[PDB]
Amino acid sequence: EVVSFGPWSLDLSTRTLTREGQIVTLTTGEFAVLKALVQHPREPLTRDKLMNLARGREWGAMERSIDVQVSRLRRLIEDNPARARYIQTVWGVGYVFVPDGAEHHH
Amino acid sequence: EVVSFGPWSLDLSTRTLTREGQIVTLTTGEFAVLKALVQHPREPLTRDKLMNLARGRERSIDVQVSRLRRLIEDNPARARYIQTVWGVGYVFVPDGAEHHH
């Protein structure tokens, strides 16, 4: 079960993120949040749903953790982190994984 | 069970890190690694012992420690609370005391 997006590939078996031959170091949390997003393409996830998927509901009180984790994923995977395309912000709700990097209008 | 080090306080009950009245945002991993370290003061932990304590179920740890350091250390390049045990892993020194003392 390997998912691709632009130059990135994520292998959910070996829990590895690759690009251009190199395996990139992710934290367990970054991996868990990325996994959740790629397993829900084009579906908006609230910050709570993301934490519930990534880490379980016993961590729910550290919800703000997710915004930090997403911003670190973005610095890594986005052509331009300030203009994220793979992980887009759903305003007032949370985040959405767009595998093709397509804007809202398409 | 609240532990202090310099201006920092960590409440293992409410899982909150405070300084100067402000609660600081940690990731679950940063919290788990910090908890492990403060629960083992002056005991060198290998990278594996740290991962076993933090997450049960690991290069992740070095990244997590370096982020903890950027946050908690007066000078991150000269860590005093989280010191490097060369070739082994890391040690939590609550008073920030150097190796010679």
Residue numbers in the entry:
A (entry chain A): 152 to 257
B (entry chain C): 152 to 208, 214 to 257
Reproduce passages from the article.
Typically, TCSs consist of an histidine kinase (HK) that senses specific external stimuli, and a response regulator (RR) that mediates the cellular response through differential expression of target genes. OmpR/EnvZ is a well-studied TCS in Enterobacteriaceae, where OmpR is the RR and EnvZ is the HK sensor. We demonstrated that OmpR is a key regulator of A. baumannii virulence using different infection models and diverse clinical strains.
To enable the discovery of a small molecule inhibitor of OmpR, we solved the crystal structure of OmpRABA DNA binding domain (DBD) spanning the C-terminal residues 148 to 254 at a resolution of 2.2 Å. The analysis of the crystal structure showed that OmpRABA DBD consists of a three-stranded antiparallel β-sheet (β1, V153-F156; β2, W159-D162; β3, R166-T169) followed by three α-helices (α1, T179-E190; α2, R198-R206; α3, R215-I228) and ending with a β-hairpin (β4, I238-V241; β5, V244-F248). The arrangement of the β-sheets and α-helices represents the winged helix-turn-helix (wHTH) fold characteristic of DNA-binding proteins of the OmpR superfamily. The sequence identity between OmpRABA DBD and OmpRECO DBD is 69% and all the amino acid residues of OmpRECO that are involved in the DNA binding were conserved in OmpRABA. Hotspot 2 in OmpRABA-DBD chain D contains residues S222, R223 and R226 (S206, R207 and R210 in OmpRECO DBD). We used our developed D-ELISA to evaluate the inhibitory effect of the virtual hits on OmpRABA DNA binding. We only observed a dose-dependent inhibition of OmpRABA DNA binding for the compound VSIS_039 (STL300125, Vitas-M Chemical Limited), which was identified to bind to the hotspot 2 druggable pocket of OmpR (Figure 6(a,b)).
